[PDB]
Every structure is written in structure tokens, then in C-alpha cells.
Design a protein around this ligand. Structure first.
Ligand SMILES: [Cl-]
Ligand SMILES: [Cl-]
Ligand SMILES: [Cl-]
Ligand SMILES: [Cl-]
Ligand SMILES: [Mn+2]
Ligand SMILES: [Mn+2]
Ligand SMILES: [Mn+2]
Ligand SMILES: [Mn+2]
Ligand SMILES: [Mn+2]
Ligand SMILES: [Mn+2]
Ligand SMILES: [Mn+2]
Ligand SMILES: [Mn+2]
Ligand SMILES: [Mn+2]
Ligand SMILES: [Mn+2]
Ligand SMILES: [Mn+2]
Ligand SMILES: [Mn+2]
Lengths: 84, 94, 108, 99, 97, 78, 91, 104
DNA sequence: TCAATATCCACCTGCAGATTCTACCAAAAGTGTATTTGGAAACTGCTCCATCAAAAGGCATGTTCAGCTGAATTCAGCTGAACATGCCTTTTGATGGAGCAGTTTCCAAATACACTTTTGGTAGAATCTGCAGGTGGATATTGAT
DNA sequence: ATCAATATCCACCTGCAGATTCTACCAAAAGTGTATTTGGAAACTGCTCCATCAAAAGGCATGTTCAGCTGAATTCAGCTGAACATGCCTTTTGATGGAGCAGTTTCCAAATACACTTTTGGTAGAATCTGCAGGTGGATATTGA
């Protein structure tokens, strides 16, 4: 299996623009895209860290949707729809 | 193998009561189950806390009721308290 | 033995009183659980799901669909002040957002 | 002419469209890779249930979308219409996130 | 006579108050305000003195915090004067509005 | 009574918050926020009072109210 | 009567600062602190055990809880301190 | 011969055990859980006291008061993060004036 | 730069309210003694998580090109800051009670246990039907004149 | 105001996924009878929480002046929005291993359960002492000149 690098750039300019649109943003500065990637990175890392912590506590090698749900819930970011 | 419990069945009955004509996609039922589980935990949690703050070892409908008042906003609380009280007095009336 | 009557019917409810009672005992909420606690809890739960299904169903109708989907649940929640507060820190997968554009952004 | 919409017209057209729909706006495979890369840096040999990756995407997109609304409010507050990094920072600061 | 320029005394107070910890709201007026609001939830209530103090502490720490976010919002709009739109913006982002 | 919370007191609070210049409309605005805050906390507290079947609001009632409103206070019993 | 962590906080105070004392108001702050952290850790351990369908909270649950609640460095040392107390106790 | 002394702690192990049992957290509690939990509670306590002690010493005072606990916490990245949604009564705020507000 | 106003910064000073400190008792906390039982091993059954193949076409990447937006610059009308000036509450104490949180102790009512009976609810299957995805024209909206 | 370009609606279709409904079984929820508290009685008892003055200072409420801050208006150098050409790589669809999650079944090492048996943490009055709050006195910092 190949090495994983620079995947944060997979979060393209077009995709960030779409998200801002849904968020009601009309005009976007050129520097928004890198800040966004940075912000998303931190968000993901924190949720993945807690999620993976639940996985390991359960002696599993597979991250389950529940792991993510509990990770989100404890970060005050409760998610409906994968609870089962 | 093994069975997984859920409120789907009940959510579905209530749905038919308010919207006879209407159905619901499984994704939407999935969200309804998360909602029921969430509020249940929020209420039991606050109830458990209430009982513990008052050195009481049992959670009675009285705890569930204060929890509801502390959890739900305005009208929602009032209506829920009404249905809650109604079910209990009806339940106890044999 | 005697005519088996569910606590739900005895309570005049659709939601499962027995199930809810069990969940309380096995949730480590308290040493003991009163008989009226699950009855009152099942009723509040049933009332709340009736309230959001009522509104979701209307949202569905407005979009000319007969089947409630997540987006209809979002509209019902976000458009009702109280439910919105109650679920103010909850995210509904596949629900999107409410159409809302700040005035200053519209063509002069 | 050739016909040409004025700047801002298509942007508003896009806002109405995306606020109307609920599908995910980030591409799937790329997002999946980002998750596996980040996970891998925390712990090796990890595998994911497909719904776990979808739960993460649903969460990140709701989060970014909500952050852009606050960001948009911060820009408007500065008598602007263009969101800038400084706006996103003001929002996360007031939100109590990184502060 | 002798006058300090606008803002000079303002900065002086910021330094004094950011350095002290005493409650900045007159005690009596506060207690008076608390009982009035409480009276609407249940009549003839008695209040533990420590209960009133906890409220004033929470309340003052809350306003001070809110004033910091408000100041930031005003600085953002390139102003130095806080205004209702500033308190309003901050409460919205915080999810209070 | 809300008027009891005076301009000069609001000024001090703002000062501890690092505010240098204050618009005249801030005072009434601040009072409204102050009132909403106290109403929310006190309501939750008195609800803990009434549940404990007491007639006296205790610091713990307040501390518990604060905790559930996301405003945890240290120094009064928790 | 009413029990607090006061006595213990004070003992610990003397170890880090023999020469330093502590006002009662500040002692109140420390009690609130100990109580709060206790609830947070106990609460998370409670959930961890429930998610994993267990009826008992072991040092293993308290450890994951600490790992999920404390920021980076604080977590490490806390974890160090904890396993250190448990090993020494087991002997 | 107490468990705290056996664990080599100054924090009440027996009490942490009793509190865990009576708090409705789980049906049963391991023997090491209260030991661990108590060690963790002690360590954070020493950490705060250490810094608040330094805060007092820097104020040329020998008795730690609330102000000192506030300066120790807010000036520490991690403790600040941990107690981010907590307010220390009578602790005030960190001296801090936005640059733009400075004169001339 | 100079002269002076009002602001800090200091090393001392000394009660005083708030701290260490004293000297006894119950409600834990630590001990032996069974009594239980939760939940690591040990296996397997059998989901469902990686990987791969192959084929498009949706959608990302780069460029042009110039509309109009973010940012300087100005400028002056007011809004807030700084300041005496009085004067009205907030503050600070000591009652003096009266309201009331806390026990005591008591049992009738309300759980928790135990041990079978009696079905409502959960897989899968079989059966049923909204509506996603396409199309082709009615409006509808924009932007050049 | 007028076109014409281009972007929406708005029904009208119909087979699929996906819902619904149909069946077969247990895992639970229901009965019953038997111990076990739970915690809501009514009677009292020391806090400690108001209501009462007092008397002051403080600290707040009022104008006065005018410094300098916030908009309003104007200008313009690009930045960032459309539109278009290219063709990359995410999507879609199966087809397979097996990696590894769940089930079922053992039992011990590790918790409850329980009466005792000390012990420690609390509480109510002894002896102190860390600083708050004041003080002349000495540079500062801020301003008008
Ligand atoms: Cl009950
Ligand atoms: Cl910026
Ligand atoms: Cl305003
Ligand atoms: Cl353990
Ligand atoms: Mn209806
Ligand atoms: Mn077993
Ligand atoms: Mn140009
Ligand atoms: Mn502009
Ligand atoms: Mn002027
Ligand atoms: Mn009485
Ligand atoms: Mn049946
Ligand atoms: Mn369609
Ligand atoms: Mn290309
Ligand atoms: Mn295998
Ligand atoms: Mn002792
Ligand atoms: Mn001093």
C-alpha cells in the first residue's frame, strides 16, 4: 500500500467555495482556501483522535461509526443518523 | 446472530396518528432514533443528578418532571408536563 | 394467569413503557426507579416525536412528497423556535441548511 | 454577445442552489484519504467502517458550513462582502474554539 | 486648570480594574434586582447570602467576558468604540442569539 | 431595579474587559443582556429550590444552575 | 457533617510549597476543582464502560477517560502518576 | 495501613472509592480505579498549587488567594484549556490591553 | 526642551479579621469470610473492509479579462471623555425575631427479588410503490441598449 | 422600455431501489408472592435570613467643554468573479479474499456481602500573623508651552 501525503489538498478550491455558498457567502478572498484547509485539519484531527481512542479502548482495529458519534458528542458536536 | 432494539415501530405508530398518508425514509427514521435516545439520556441524566443532589436513591416521575422543566423550552415543557402527568395518573388509575 | 396488559396501554401510550423502565434501571442513573418514572418519560418522549413528526410531515407536504426525509426534519426543527433551541447543538445528517441570504448581499 | 452575467449574480445563484440541497460538497474519495492519512499519523494498521467515514464527512461539512455563516457575519460587520482569513479567526475566537 | 486627554483616564481605569478582583456592581442594587426576577418564578423566597454572591460573581464574569468579545468585534470594524451591534454580533457567534 | 445597575458600574465592567470607548446606547443594551442572563440562571436555580421543596435559594442551587447553563462557578460548593 | 478535600489539598500544598499558605476562599476554589475533575473523569469512565457493555469501572476506564479529558502534557503525567500509584499499591 | 499510604498518595483513596460506588457510574468498581483516580486528582492539585504558589511568590505574598489561582490557570496553556468553561470566583482577569487602544 | 500637575512606586508600620492550632467522638475505612459473577481466553461463524479492474463523464485546473470592491484619504459634525459640583443612596453594623432547614422515628406504601408464563418486537422474506432522473416547453430573470 | 439569452420552474412519465407488509421466533415484559427499604408523616431546635433603624461617606447623577473618533464621500489599483478549453481522476459496478468483529461457552481472579474493629476526618473553641490600608517622600508620566 502506497504512502499517504498532502491529502489536505484534496479539499479543493471548488469544494470550499461550495461550502461557503451553502453557508451564504457571496465573495471569497484568495487566502480563504488555505485557512479553511488548516481549520478543517484541526477539526478532523481532534475528532479522529477521540474516535480512535474509543476504538483502542475497545481493543478493536476498526473505527466504527459509533466511535465517531461518541467522539463528536464529547466535543459538543452531536450527530444524528449514524447512531445505528 | 443477535438482535438490535430501536424505537422505529413506535415512531411509525405516532407518525400514522399525525399523518395517516405519510411515510418516512430509513435515513429519517435513523435520525428519529438518535433524537429519542438523545432526549432520553438528557432527561434521565438530569433526573439522576436531581435525585443525587437531594440525597434520594430513587428516580420518581417527580424527578423526570423537574428534569423536563429544566431541559425543554417554554411551551414544549408545558405540553410535555401535561402529557407526562396525564399518563401517570391514568397509569395509576389501574 | 391474568389478562396480560402492557403498561403502555395501561398508560394510554404508543411508546414502550417496559423498555423505557429497563433502560432506566440499566443506565446507572439511580439505585432505584419509581414505577411512574418510565411512564412519564415514555410520554414526554412520545409527545416530542409527535411534535417533530407533525411539522416534518407538513414540510414534506409543502415539498409535495409523501415520504419524510432528513431535509424535512431539518426544516421542521430549524423553523420552530423551541425545537431549534432544544436541538441547537445537534446536527442532522443530510438535512442541509435553511435558505437564508443576508440582505446586504442582494443586488442593490 | 457573448452573453455574460455580472460578477455576483452567479454567486447568488450558487447560494440559492446549495442552500436548497443537502448532498455533500466535498468529493468522497479525496475526503476518505484525508481521514486515513490523519488517522494513520495517530495510529497505524487502522481500518474504517464505511459509515464512520461518512459520519466524519457529514460532521466536517456541517461544521465548515456553520463556520462560514459566522465568518460571513463578521465580514458584513466590517462593512465588507468578501470573507477574509481574519473573519474566520474572529469567529473561532468568539466561538471559544482556538482563542 | 489641567485636563487629561480623552482616553488617557480610560486606559488608566482599564489598568486598575484588570488588576483588581472586587465586584464592580453595587451590592444592594444587585440583590434588589435578583429578588425581583426570582419573585416571578415563586413568591416569598428567602436567599442564602452566599447564593446572591455566586450570582453576582457569575454575572460579572459573564459581562466582562462578553465585553472582551464585544471589544474585539468593534476593533474588527476598525472602531475603538463598542456599540450595540458589537454586543449583538458577539452574542450571535457565541450561540446566545 | 434594572436601572439600579448604573452607567458607571457598567463602565467598570467594560473596563475590566479592556474597553476604551463606549457608545451611549451600550448601557441599556447591557442591562437587557444582564436581565436575560439572570432570568435564565435564577429560573433554573429556583427550579432546584422548588424541587428540594425548600423556600430558600441556596448557593448550591445557583452553582447547579450555572453548571447546566455552561457557566461553571468555582468557590461556592462546587 | 460536611466533608471536603481541604485537608488533602493542604497536605499537597506543603509538599510543593512548605512556606506557602492558602486563604479559605482559595481552598473553596480547589474543592470545586477537585469535585469537577472527579465528575468529569468518573462520568467519562461511566460512558466508556457503558459503550463497551461492561458493569465495572477499572483503572483502564479511568485511564482512557483521563486521556480523553486532559490536554496533551497534562494527560501524560496524569497517566504516569496513575499507573505509578496503581503498581505501588499492587505491591 | 490505609490504601492511600499503600498507593503512596496523600489523597483519600477509600473516599474516592466510596464516591465512585455511590455516584451511580457503574454497577461495580475495580480495586485500582480509586487509586488511579486519586493519583490523577492529586497530581492536578499539585500542578495548580505549584503555579499559584509561584504566582503568590511573584506578588510578594505567602498565602495563595483566588487571584493567584486565576493567574496560574489563565497563564498556563493546558490548564486554561482544561478550565476554559470555568470561572474562579474573585479571580479577575489577566492584564491585557489591545495594541490599537494604546495612545500615540 | 521647560515647568507643574496629578499619578505611581516605595519601604515602613500595626492592628485585625482570618489562619494555623488545641482536644475529643462518630461515621467511615480497613479487616477476615464466604458468595458471586463479570468478562478475559478459546474458538468459530460469517459480516463487511480492503483492493482491484475497467469505463466514462462529472467536475477540477488554469487562463483571460475587466467589473466593482476593499482601502486609502479627507474632512467635519457630533458623540463620548474628562471634570468639578452637589446630593442621594449603598454600606456597615447590632439587634430581635421568626422562618425553616435539618433530625428523629415511624411505618404504610412503594420498590426490589425470585421464578416461572405469556407475547410484543426483531430478523429476514416476500410484496408493494414514491419519486429520482429525464424531457420538453411555460414563465422568469438578467443585462445590453 | 425592449428584447434575447439563459436560467428556472412545472407538470408528465415509470421502472427500481427502497419502503411496507407478512411470518417465525425468542428475548423481554408480565404476573405473583415475599423481603426490604423509601422517604413523606408531625414535633422540635438551633441557625441564619429578613426587617429596623441609624449615620456616613462614597459613589452616582448633572451640566460644560471640546478632543478626536466615526462616518460620508471620492478615487482607483488590482483582486477575485465569470466563462471557456482540457482532460484527469472521482464515480460506478461487481468480484474476492480474509481480517476481525461479534456471538456461544468455560471458569478463575476479582468484585460484592457482612459483621466487627479500629481510625481518621470534622467540629467547636485556643493562640497568631499575613497583609490591608496609611504614610511622607521620591521619581514618573502626561500636558500645556
Ligand atoms: Cl414514580
Ligand atoms: Cl485577513
Ligand atoms: Cl449599534
Ligand atoms: Cl481496577
Ligand atoms: Mn394530523
Ligand atoms: Mn457470567
Ligand atoms: Mn481597471
Ligand atoms: Mn467599496
Ligand atoms: Mn473639531
Ligand atoms: Mn416554624
Ligand atoms: Mn404476537
Ligand atoms: Mn425530479
Ligand atoms: Mn486538467
Ligand atoms: Mn482471522
Ligand atoms: Mn485525627
Ligand atoms: Mn499595600
Amino acid at each position: 500500500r502506497k504512502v499517504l501525503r498532502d491529502n489536505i489538498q484534496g479539499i479543493t478550491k471548488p469544494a470550499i467555495r461550495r461550502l461557503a455558498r451553502r453557508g451564504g457567502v457571496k465573495r471569497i478572498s484568495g487566502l480563504i482556501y488555505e485557512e479553511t484547509r488548516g481549520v478543517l485539519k484541526v477539526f478532523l484531527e481532534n475528532v479522529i483522535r477521540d474516535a480512535v481512542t474509543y476504538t483502542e479502548h475497545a481493543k478493536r482495529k476498526t473505527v466504527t461509526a459509533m466511535d465517531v458519534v461518541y467522539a463528536l458528542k464529547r466535543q459538543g458536536r452531536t450527530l444524528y443518523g449514524f447512531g445505528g | 446472530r443477535s438482535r438490535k432494539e430501536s424505537y422505529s415501530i413506535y415512531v411509525y405508530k405516532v407518525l400514522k396518528q399525525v399523518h395517516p398518508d405519510t411515510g418516512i425514509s430509513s435515513k429519517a427514521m435513523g435520525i428519529m432514533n438518535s433524537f429519542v435516545n438523545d432526549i432520553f439520556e438528557r432527561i434521565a441524566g438530569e433526573a439522576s443528578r436531581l435525585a443525587h443532589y437531594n440525597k434520594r436513591s430513587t428516580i420518581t416521575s417527580r424527578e423526570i418532571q423537574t428534569a423536563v422543566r429544566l431541559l425543554l423550552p417554554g411551551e414544549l415543557a408545558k405540553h410535555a408536563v401535561s402529557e407526562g402527568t396525564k399518563a401517570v395518573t391514568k397509569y395509576t388509575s389501574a | 394467569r391474568a389478562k396480560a396488559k402492557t403498561r403502555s396501554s395501561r398508560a394510554g401510550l404508543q411508546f414502550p413503557v417496559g423498555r423505557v423502565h429497563r433502560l432506566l434501571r440499566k443506565g446507572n442513573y439511580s439505585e432505584r426507579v419509581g414505577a411512574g418514572a418510565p411512564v412519564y418519560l415514555a410520554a414526554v418522549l412520545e409527545y416530542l416525536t409527535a411534535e417533530i413528526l407533525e411539522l416534518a410531515g407538513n414540510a414534506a407536504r409543502d415539498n409535495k412528497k409523501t415520504r419524510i426525509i432528513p431535509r424535512h426534519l431539518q426544516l421542521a426543527i430549524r423553523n420552530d423556535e423551541e425545537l431549534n433551541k432544544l436541538l441547537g447543538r445537534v446536527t442532522i445528517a443530510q438535512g442541509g441548511v435553511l435558505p437564508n441570504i443576508q440582505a446586504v448581499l442582494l443586488p442593490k | 454577445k457573448p452573453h455574460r452575467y455580472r460578477p455576483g449574480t452567479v454567486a447568488l445563484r450558487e447560494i440559492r442552489r446549495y442552500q436548497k440541497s443537502t448532498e455533500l460538497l466535498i468529493r468522497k474519495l479525496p475526503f476518505q484519504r484525508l481521514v486515513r492519512e490523519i488517522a494513520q499519523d495517530f495510529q497505524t494498521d487502522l481500518r474504517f467502517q464505511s459509515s464512520a467515514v461518512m459520519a466524519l464527512q457529514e460532521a466536517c461539512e456541517a461544521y465548515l458550513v456553520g463556520l462560514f455563516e459566522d465568518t460571513n457575519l463578521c465580514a458584513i460587520h466590517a462593512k465588507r462582502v468578501t470573507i477574509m482569513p481574519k473573519d474566520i479567526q474572529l469567529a473561532r475566537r468568539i466561538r471559544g474554539e482556538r482563542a
